[PDB]
């Protein structure tokens, strides 16, 4: 998912930007 700024933050930060590279690799 693309997010809006704070939004996706998260996932650019620690942990959940690990999950979701896994993820984009996965699909």
């Given at each position: 998912?693309?997010?809006?700024?704070?939004?996706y933050?998260?996932?650019?930060?620690?942990?959940?930007?690990?999950?979701?590279?896994?993820?984009?690799?996965?699909?």
């Open positions: 998912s693309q997010g809006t700024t704070s939004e933050s998260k996932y650019l930060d620690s942990r959940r930007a690990q999950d979701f590279v896994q993820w984009l690799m996965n699909t």
